Design a protein around this nucleic acid. Structure first.
Lengths: 123, 1364
RNA sequence: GGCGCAUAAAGAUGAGACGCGUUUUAGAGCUAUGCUGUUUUGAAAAAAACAGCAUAGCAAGUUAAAAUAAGGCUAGUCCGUUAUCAACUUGAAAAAGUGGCACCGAGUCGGUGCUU
């Protein structure tokens, strides 16, 4: 009926998507609702999943030499098929502080390989 | 010392700035409490308050009504259990106990494991005999022998938990569920609306086509093949498309601008619907509701498919048919995969993670995700027939508990519930006594008017009772005082009027409200008969004739029917051109024709006596949904209506509320004529005004009569007064925080009051900043203009909307590839030298709009007049201008500007318009903020009845600070730092106090109060420049912003230079010292110390993230109940810390468990905050801190600002995560350079000063190296991102030879390393650089805490290293 | 800025109901081999499974119960995510109260003098 701020901000985010790529049918994933709440970003990549962006945590003023960590964390990806390509609408939560893990050397290439069409924040 | 205060109110920011006579912000050494050794901080009295947005209350309303509906459903279950419990304890002892603990692990479960039937064998035999519960339910309906009682409880409890929508009222007659009747109702609605192109549905068979077994789109096109044909993309075709479930696109049917897709089955339908209804007019919402209930009728006949074995269970038989066809297609597809694809069988049926079938059942994956997955690998296989037609119809492998059961009406559950209860009543006399009890547990809906069934303790309830006991659905009738509950419902759920409070508004379809809106449209229609050349508006008897003739005959009347039935038929005129209405009358008497076709009596509705009868009828239909309180609030009106219209008029519904009230339209009267607003809009005489003019007319009494009521709507407390405003709770958070800032700030300045509070507030914006939502309607204007005129341009030079932010190109297209000045063709390759031309110049009003800017070849193809150019220009181009206006490229405003010299020139009312459109402000909420501030700051009454208005709270628009910003190069870049709130506040203060010193004669237009009625007829000259120092006129050049300038560049190249040191005329005091005031302002916009405060709020909100995460062996999870340990049951995760408190106590450290003194930053969640503030040292002893010191606990919310070595400021954001608390001050030369270089093409001005500024860009290329030097010298101090700074230095060095526009835009991207708040990842040229998070929280506790005030002028610097 | 038709748009709060969704348990998973597992004839292993754990192959797979913020006291078929919220001094709480000023300058505010 009336919807939450989290799926209101998603609603203009996909509305900013549906106009400027092409015209298409089969629009909706639109989502599970409880997953839209606890995810910080709605990115949309082209032909691939949002390979997770990454960060580093400086720890007790003796931060070691370039240990990268996955600040984001993909929770749900769902694809829309705009006539030729497969745009991956994917809502991404951040990771908290205590549960960061070390990212491998492949993922540092993937974020530079990406083509972020639209990253729209939503709390 | 006199002073002023400038205020910039926003949603996320309040900017505040204090100025003096000489425009300097002050400089006042402030005392600092606490225990650090800095005892005096010098601070500038400029700054801002930063706070995250005030979230609206409807998310809580969603969660609260969800809590209520879960509690009501649990109590329906408990009602059925307290019925069954006696003879259940006769039959099975702990059955309801086992269903109560069905959730538990076998160790926690203190009975047997199997809920039904107890032991191991009987539960297995139960699931073999009844594989779903619809088998159980389809057995208990279709049986005659007895059944087991707990098994009957399972059936009935599944009936009364999941009971379907109540949305249709009565029973399942074929008038609201047989889709022939629903489709012919939609056709009746469509022909009732249009009546030109009316579609004829005589021979269609909507049941056997729209309900038969087929795919959805194939189901669609058969129907349009039946009727003689509109389109598959017409309105009715897309409307049937909406009615079937597949998305139509309505932008072609109504010819809108943007793409608007309405899917019915989405979870965001009815908001996409009403923001489509905003573009189309709300006469279509009945057509779209007919679409929706036709869709539920179709989809109901899509679930229900059992009609041959019609035996009393049309749902349960349908779901066991769907179970059995699910089962046979599963065996078919499993055998077919192992036949033809031996690989992708483990990836389909054992998968549980990749949208396969095991993801469709065991895992979490949708239906349409599964069909997008399995449509390829079922298109691929060899024998796959009737496993694709039931995929295109969405029915292979379809579940029972799907998303589409939101269309089952509750009467189906009632029908087979009734059947279960009377098949079993012979064996169980227990149910022959309580069958009406059970059906009343099912079909009881707490109505809208009753509300929450509280007993005084709610904040939300208006239940008043006719007894005192527990309201169960049995005795809801003889407990609830329904008349008084409905009356309190009316006074809770009416709405107060905005410009006449303590009054109830009308409903949106009130009959006199429709008279009001028809007169508010007809007051601005002007007709030109053959042979007078004077457009005159309609008179009194002419309006009476047309309203009594054509509005009361047809619903919507267009201009053709207007002229045909009135000027052709009554006035007998062959053609009379009609001005104000474009194609159709926007207002319509929809309520009048609805009530005329309901009660079949025109003579009853033409009476003026029945208006209270009809308004009570419309108010009853608007407020109430319920059949009982509509039939009883119309039993008063059964005296007039012959009992078959009463069962017809009670069906009629409305929604929404009108903007106005009855005491404001036909209510208050003028003392000179006794005429209401409706009486003026019928017969105003010669000069017909509209409603906004009648309430903005200081001549008439009506604005003062509004001011008579605006005194009453003001609570004594501040918070209720702000709650009384109209706006978002974000902007109301901004208003309340700026009042906090004003009181705190006048407490700062010697406890004196200011001389001025200047306000601007431009917020609550949802226009997407007009970057991509605008260019579509730009091309819409272009293409329908070329459609109407018929001369092709995009057969020769097409440009798509990716390039149409260029304004000169758009002006090229709107004048048809020609020039509006001389009959010329604009050369397309040489458009770069063709200058930008205004019509009303930059010395008459500052504007950058299309209705003022035009394009032409030379500078003076225009003429030589400072007005709209000469009569030789406009008479010669009068042929082409009518041809281009009648195609609608350009506005009637711009045509009237280009036909303003033919009527002499600029009148007094014309320049009065040009000074009203820059000085006064039309949105209500800015006037209400001014009302708050001058009602709180000007409070001394005198011996008379007048408030001595000492502090003139004065209102700017945004364009005044905007062109003071752009024209004098005080350039704003948001992305550098958060100082631009405060610098916008300072420019607010400068422009406001300079306009109130130079122009005190206009304080009756933009200061709140009731000042003199002396208008601007005498303060503008009727001719050129007046005499020196005795000029009664203010300025003949109707621009207000001129006196800041030196040059006044006219439209004739002249520099009509104004004096250097400005003075006031009425007193001879200097208002603006051009030699040093711009030096003062540009020095103030280079303050390095500006009070940026992040408001330290305690996080109020949800307990955690609410995705229930499965059984994991972690500690991080939250138990969902107190006895459900997440190591075995799973639960929520990530508790939100409300505030991270500090503990200086002793833990048992080491192997010997020594009480070692620790200082740790403990996190207090929202779940635990109440138990914390109950007894905090008791909880900290419970947590594992010993000898806790109750005085030595300091509360730190989110955004609690610390300060570390060397001026490093880091604001806390979690239990152990920091943020960047430092701002980056940048001198104004660098900010001017970055704004010019990052807007190096889109300057939008004459190329003279654009060449000036472009040479200023190209010569100061050293500024880019200086800025990156400065960001490096900053981030080596207060950011300490070593590797990130080295990445951006190397990436700066590689792209050093790139052009200045791209390099400037990427340095404005580069500033995200140093902004306030959370660290982010930002795209410099290709190096998308990873962020760094500040998770070291052991560096914080040794460092200075600062307790900033609400403006930040008052700091209580607590040092934390001094603690133990 | 986005004055977008010189007019100025429409704003919050609130009541009811369904539908899913998510989580755990219940829907005895079977066969084969390998390991822990106990006897027989025991003078040590040799096998008669009885259970538990791995790896393959098969068997189905749709449903229900519970919960849907922890919970709270006022015990209601109510309430619990909106506004509010810097310290410090009073006050139970609401609420009230607390901080000197000119000038020269500026790198996140400094300095001088005056006054206390």
């Amino acid at each position: 009926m009336t919807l939450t701020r989290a799926q209101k901000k998603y609603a203009e985010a996909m509305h900013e998507f549906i106009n400027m790529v092409d015209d298409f049918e089969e629009s909706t994933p639109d989502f599970a609702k409880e997953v839209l709440h606890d995810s910080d970003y709605v990115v949309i990549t082209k032909n691939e999943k949002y390979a997770v962006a990454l960060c580093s945590l400086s720890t007790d003023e003796c931060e070691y030499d370039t240990n990268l960590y996955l600040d984001e964390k993909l929770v749900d990806y769902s694809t829309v098929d705009v006539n030729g390509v497969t745009y991956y609408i994917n809502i991404v939560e951040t990771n908290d502080i205590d549960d960061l893990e070390i990212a491998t050397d492949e993922d540092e290439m993937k974020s530079g390989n990406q083509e972020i069409i639209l990253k729209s924040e939503l709390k | 010392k006199k002073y002023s205060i400038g205020l910039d109110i926003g949603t996320n920011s309040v900017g505040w700035a204090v100025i003096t006579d000489d425009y300097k912000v002050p400089s006042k050494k402030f005392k600092v409490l606490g225990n650090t050794d800095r005892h005096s901080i010098k601070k500038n009295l400029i700054g801002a308050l930063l706070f995250d947005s005030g979230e609206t209350a409807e998310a809580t309303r969603l969660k609260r009504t969800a809590r209520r509906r879960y509690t009501r459903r649990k109590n329906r279950i408990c009602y059925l259990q307290e019925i069954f419990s006696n003879e259940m304890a006769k039959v099975d002892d702990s059955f309801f106990h086992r269903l109560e603990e069905s959730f538990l692990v076998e160790e926690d479960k203190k009975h047997e494991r199997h809920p039904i039937f107890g032991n191991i064998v009987d539960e297995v035999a139960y699931h073999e005999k009844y594989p779903t519960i619809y088998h159980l339910r389809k057995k208990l309906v279709d049986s005659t022998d007895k059944a087991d009682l707990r098994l009957i409880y399972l059936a009935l409890a599944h009936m009364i938990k999941f009971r379907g929508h109540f949305l249709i009222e009565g029973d399942l007659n074929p008038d609201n569920s047989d889709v022939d009747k629903l489709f012919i109702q939609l056709v009746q609605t469509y022909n009732q609306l249009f009546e030109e192109n009316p579609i004829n549905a005589s021979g269609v068979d909507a049941k056997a086509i729209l309900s038969a077994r087929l795919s959805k789109s194939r189901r669609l096109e058969n129907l349009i093949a039946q009727l003689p044909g509109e389109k598959k993309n017409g309105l009715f075709g897309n409307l049937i498309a909406l009615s079937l479930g597949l998305t139509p696109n309505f932008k072609s049917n109504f010819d809108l601008a943007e793409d608007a897709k309405l899917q019915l089955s989405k979870d965001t339908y009815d908001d996409d619907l009403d923001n489509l209804l905003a573009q189309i007019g709300d006469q279509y919402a009945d057509l779209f509701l007919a679409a929706k209930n036709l869709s539920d009728a179709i989809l109901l006949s899509d679930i229900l498919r059992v009609n041959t074995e019609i035996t009393k269970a049309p749902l349960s038989a349908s779901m066991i048919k769907r179970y059995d066809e699910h089962h046979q297609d599963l065996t078919l597809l499993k055998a077919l995969v192992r036949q033809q694809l031996p690989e992708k069988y483990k990836e389909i049926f054992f998968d549980q993670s990749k949208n396969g079938y095991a993801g469709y059942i065991d895992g979490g994956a949708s239906q349409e995700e599964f069909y997008k997955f399995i449509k390829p690998i079922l298109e691929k296989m060899d024998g796959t027939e009737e496993l694709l037609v039931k995929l295109n119809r969405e029915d292979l492998l379809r579940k029972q508990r799907t998303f589409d059961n939101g269309s089952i009406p509750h009467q189906i559950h009632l029908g087979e519930l009734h059947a279960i209860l009377r098949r079993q009543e012979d064996f169980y006399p227990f149910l022959k006594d309580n069958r009406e009890k059970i059906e009343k547990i099912l079909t009881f809906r707490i109505p809208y008017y009753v509300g929450p069934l509280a007993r005084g303790n709610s904040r939300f309830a208006w239940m008043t009772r006719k007894s005192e006991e527990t309201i169960t659905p049995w005795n809801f009738e003889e407990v609830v005082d329904k008349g008084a509950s409905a009356q309190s419902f009316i006074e809770r759920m009416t709405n107060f009027d905005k410009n006449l409070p303590n009054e109830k508004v009308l409903p949106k379809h009130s009959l006199l409200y429709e008279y009001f809106t028809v007169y508010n449209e007809l007051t601005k229609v002007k007709y030109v008969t053959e042979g007078m050349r004077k457009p005159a508006f309609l008179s009194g008897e002419q309006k009476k004739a047309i309203v009594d003739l054509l509005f009361k005959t047809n619903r919507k009347v267009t201009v053709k029917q207007l002229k045909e039935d009135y000027f052709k038929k009554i006035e007998c005129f062959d053609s009379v051109e009609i001005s104000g209405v474009e194609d159709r009358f926007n207002a319509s008497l929809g309520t009048y024709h609805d009530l005329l076709k309901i009660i079949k009596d025109k003579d009853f509705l033409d009476n003026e006596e029945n208006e209270d009868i009809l308004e009570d009828i419309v108010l009853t239909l608007t407020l109430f949904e319920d059949r009982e309180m509509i039939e009883e609030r119309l039993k008063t009106y059964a005296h007039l209506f012959d009992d078959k219209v009463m069962k017809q008029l009670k069906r009629r519904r409305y929604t929404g509320w009108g903007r106005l009230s009855r005491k404001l339209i036909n209510g208050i009267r003028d003392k000179q004529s006794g005429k209401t607003i409706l009486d003026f809009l019928k017969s105003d005489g010669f000069a017909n005004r509209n409603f906004m003019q009648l309430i903005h007319d200081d001549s008439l009494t009506f604005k003062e009569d509004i001011q008579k009521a605006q005194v009453s709507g003001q609570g004594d407390s501040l918070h209720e007064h702000i709650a009384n405003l109209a706006g978002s709770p974000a902007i109301k958070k901004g208003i309340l925080q700026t009042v906090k800032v004003v009181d705190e700030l006048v407490k700062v300045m010697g406890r004196h009051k200011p001389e001025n509070i200047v306000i601007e507030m431009a917020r609550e914006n949802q226009t997407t900043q007009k970057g991509q939502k605008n260019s579509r309607e730009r091309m819409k204007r272009i293409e329908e203009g070329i459609k109407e005129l018929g001369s092709q341009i995009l057969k020769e030079h097409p440009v798509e909307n990716t390039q149409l932010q260029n304004e000169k190109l758009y002006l090229y297209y709107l004048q048809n590839g020609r020039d509006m000045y001389v009959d010329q063709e604009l050369d397309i390759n040489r458009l770069s030298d063709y200058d930008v031309d205004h019509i009303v110049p930059q010395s008459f009003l500052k504007d950058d709009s299309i209705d003022n800017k035009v394009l032409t070849r030379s500078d003076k193809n225009r003429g030589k007049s400072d007005n709209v150019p000469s009569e030789e220009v406009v008479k010669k181009m009068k042929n082409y201008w009518r041809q281009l206006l009648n195609a609608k490229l350009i506005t009637q405003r711009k045509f009237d500007n280009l036909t303003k010299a033919e009527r002499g020139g600029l009148s007094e009312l014309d320049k009065a318009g040009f000074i009203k459109r820059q000085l006064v402000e039309t949105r209500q909420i800015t006037k209400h903020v001014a009302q708050i501030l001058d009602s709180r700051m000007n409070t001394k009454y005198d011996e008379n009845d007048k408030l001595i208005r000492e502090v003139k709270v004065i209102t700017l628009k945004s364009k005044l600070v905007s062109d003071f910003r752009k024209d004098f190069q005080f350039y704003k870049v948001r992305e550098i730092n958060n100082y631009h709130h405060a610098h916008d506040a300072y420019l607010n203060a400068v422009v406001g106090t300079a306009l109130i010193k130079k122009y005190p004669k206009l304080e009756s237009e933009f200061v709140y109060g009731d000042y003199k009625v002396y208008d601007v007829r005498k303060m503008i000259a009727k001719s050129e420049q007046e005499i020196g120092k005795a000029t009664a006129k203010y300025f003949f050049y109707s621009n207000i912003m001129n006196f800041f300038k030196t040059e006044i560049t006219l439209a004739n190249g002249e520099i009509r230079k104004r004096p250097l040191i400005e003075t006031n005329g009425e007193t001879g005091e200097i208002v603006w010292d051009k030699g040093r005031d711009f030096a003062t302002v540009r020095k103030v916009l280079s303050m390095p110390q500006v009070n940026i405060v992040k408001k330290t709020e305690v996080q109020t909100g949800g307990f955690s993230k609410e995705s229930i995460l499965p059984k994991r062996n972690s500690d991080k999870l939250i138990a969902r109940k107190k006895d459900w340990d997440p190591k075995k049951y799973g639960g929520f995760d990530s508790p939100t810390v409300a505030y991270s408190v500090l503990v200086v106590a002793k833990v048992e450290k080491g192997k010997s468990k020594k009480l070692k003194s620790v200082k740790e930053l403990l996190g207090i969640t929202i779940m635990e905050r109440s138990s914390f503030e109950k007894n905090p040292i008791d909880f900290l002893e419970a947590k594992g801190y010993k000898e806790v010191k109750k005085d030595l606990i300091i509360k730190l919310p989110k955004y609690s600002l610390f300060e570390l070595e060397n001026g490093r400021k880091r604001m806390l954001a979690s239990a152990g995560e920091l943020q960047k608390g430092n701002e980056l001050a940048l001198p104004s030369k660098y900010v001017n350079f970055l704004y010019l270089a990052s807007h190096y093409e889109k300057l939008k001005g004459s190329p003279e000063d654009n060449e000036q500024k472009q040479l200023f860009v190209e010569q100061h290329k050293h500024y880019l190296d200086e800025i990156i030097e400065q960001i490096s010298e900053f981030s080596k101090r207060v950011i300490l991102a070593d590797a990130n700074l080295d990445k951006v230095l190397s990436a700066y060095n590689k792209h050093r030879d790139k052009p200045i526009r791209e390099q400037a835009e990427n340095i404005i991207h580069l500033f995200t390393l140093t902004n306030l708040g959370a660290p982010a990842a930002f795209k410099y040229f290709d190096t998308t650089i990873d962020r760094k998070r500040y998770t070291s929280t052991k560096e914080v506790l040794d460092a200075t805490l600062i307790h900033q005030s609400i403006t930040g002028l008052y700091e209580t610097r607590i040092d934390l290293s001094q603690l133990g």
